[PDB]
């Protein structure tokens, strides 16, 4: 519980690690790793309303959580070059299990107004969707 490696908010998974310089045998020590999963019991499969029933199966691949594909900057000789950081990021397309506090999620519903119909837009998470 000391250094954060992964803090993922599409799946709501968090991985930390710490070198525990243990008491007995004081010239060797362990490496501990903590994983925390929070499982929502009322979310759907796709995040729209009538999709499919509530999700009952949750799968986590640690090779995908630890992935790193955004380009970085490296000073080699007296230069700045751009490099990648992973072997597998041939492509959003991932499925999310929870929401995220900092993003809107909307929908579209047709309702009637006497004559024709409209394409009324509906906020699914009302705190994060004010225009500001």
């Amino acid at each position: 519980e000391r250094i954060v490696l992964v803090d993922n908010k599409c799946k709501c998974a968090r991985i930390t690690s710490r070198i525990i310089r243990s008491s007995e045998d004081p010239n060797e020590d362990i490496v501990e790793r903590n994983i925390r999963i929070i499982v929502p019991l009322n979310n759907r499969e796709n995040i729209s309303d009538p999709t499919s029933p509530l999700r009952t199966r949750f799968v986590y691949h640690l090779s995908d959580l630890c992935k790193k594909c955004d380009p970085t900057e490296v000073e080699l000789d007296n230069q700045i070059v751009t490099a990648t950081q992973s072997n597998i990021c041939d492509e959003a397309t991932e499925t999310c299990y929870t929401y995220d506090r900092n993003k809107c999620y909307t929908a579209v519903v047709p309702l009637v107004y006497g004559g024709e119909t409209k394409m009324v837009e509906t906020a699914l998470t009302p705190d994060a969707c004010y225009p500001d």
């Binding site: 490696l5 710490r18 925390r36 929070i38 490099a83 506090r101």
Partner: protein
């Protein structure tokens, strides 16, 4: 002896880090090395230099030429057609060179030190393996933190071809020895590999002691009837 003609590709260290992709054309097997001919097909900055006719196997003179240029017409797929129409033969001969197609891109892997080097507390070894690339050219550098180490601190082998799973691909390795104390203090190291088939021309892997195979694992699964927002 017997005359021959050759054309070699530009070196990868000046094509990727810089862009000055000079070419070279070489004829060997002459003893009157003043009367010679070189002609490329494009020559706009046509000052193709020639050098001193250095020796060869058992003291035969050898002439060569360099046509300067940079890396936009090479990587776009042009062609160069050096030819020797010297008067030491009564018939000329020709060769050409083009950027190689049918490429593959490598897979880079960094490996942590073995377990039985950590007992001695003297020095530990880090191995870098790059596999499966179709041309025979590659670059390997090392970094500590964000500082590049000088080239006299690690050993890099050569690039060889591996047992055939259908098509011909290559491999290369490299090792580096660092102090055993500052690996445990928490420094980070990186192996950087450059090859002309990668999209951003470079790729990097970074390893340290905390991002390794753990001894203890703690898993806690919490079930949240409340909300699905993940604060």
């Amino acid at each position: 002896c017997h005359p021959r003609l050759s054309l070699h590709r530009p070196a990868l260290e000046d094509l990727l880090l810089g862009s000055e992709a000079n070419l070279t054309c070489t004829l060997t097997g002459l003893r009157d090395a003043s009367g010679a001919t070189f002609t490329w097909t494009p020559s706009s900055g046509k000052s193709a230099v020639q050098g001193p006719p250095e020796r060869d196997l058992c003291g035969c003179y050898s002439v060569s030429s360099v046509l300067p240029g940079c890396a936009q017409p090479w990587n776009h797929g042009e062609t160069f057609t050096c030819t020797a129409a010297h008067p030491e033969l009564k018939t000329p001969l020709t060769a050409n060179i083009t950027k190689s197609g049918n490429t593959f891109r490598p897979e880079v892997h960094l490996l942590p030190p073995p377990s039985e080097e950590l007992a001695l507390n003297e020095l530990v070894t880090l191995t870098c393996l790059a596999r499966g690339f179709s041309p025979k050219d590659v670059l390997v550098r090392w970094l500590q933190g964000s500082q590049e180490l000088p080239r006299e601190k690690y050993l890099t082998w050569a690039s060889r071809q591996e047992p055939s799973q259908g098509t011909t691909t290559y491999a290369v390795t490299s090792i580096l020895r660092v102090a055993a104390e500052d690996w445990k203090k928490g420094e980070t190291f990186s192996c950087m590999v450059g090859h002309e088939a990668l999209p951003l021309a470079f790729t990097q892997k970074t390893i340290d002691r905390l991002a390794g195979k753990p001894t203890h694992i703690n898993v806690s699964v919490v079930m949240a009837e409340a909300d699905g927002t993940c604060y």
